[PDB]
Curated annotation (Swiss-Prot), chain A:
Domain of life: Bacteria
Subcellular location: Cell membrane
Disruption outcome: Probably essential, it was not disrupted in a global transposon mutagenesis study.
Protein name: Mgp-operon protein 3
Taxonomic path: Bacteria, Bacillati, Mycoplasmatota, Mycoplasmoidales, Mycoplasmoidaceae
Swiss-Prot record, chain B:
Organism: Mycoplasma genitalium (strain ATCC 33530 / DSM 19775 / NCTC 10195 / G37)
Compartments where found: Cell membrane
Highest taxon above the source species: Bacteria
Protein's job: The protein is the major adhesin mediating the attachment of this mycoplasma to the ciliated epithelium.
Protein's gene: mgpA
Whole sequence portion shown: 1209 to 1258 of 1444
Entry similarity comment: Belongs to the adhesin P1 family.
Name used for this protein in its record: Adhesin P1
Amino acid sequence: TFLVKEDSKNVTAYTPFATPITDSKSDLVSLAQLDSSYQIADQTIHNTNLFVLFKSRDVKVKYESSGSNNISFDSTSQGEKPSYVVEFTNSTGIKWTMVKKYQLDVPNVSSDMNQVLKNLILEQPLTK
Amino acid sequence: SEIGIGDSTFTKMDGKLTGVVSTPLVNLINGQGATSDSDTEKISFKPGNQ
């Protein structure tokens, strides 16, 4: 059977005859136990399980030139929304169930790294 | 009746009798009374799409 991303959060399964499977439209963001700001960024099939990348529209990160923990989530602005990778499986039609959930933490910064970063400058992104 | 000599029983039928349509399951006079058959009404095929 084939999987179809209906929107930024739901996934519907279709049979080989191009017909949808009834009661297969699954909200994987909810199933992954993640809030409304999250949306599926990428999906892949390994083993027989579905692997899904999620990322929040509410994420806020900070850079402080001083200290040891130079890169971190802006907890103060309700932007402590890290990305996650979730493994999903079939317990059945199609019924999804979460296997493993992996968070994507911010990078670790060394004193040698922070000396460059301190004065690191970036050009505005190229647009259409 | 014990020797096998007797009278035939009669069932009245409405209208004009012309013939009978006999299948290995049913005998219908003038081909009237054809039904779906109650036994096999709960048995069907799984559609190819699913």
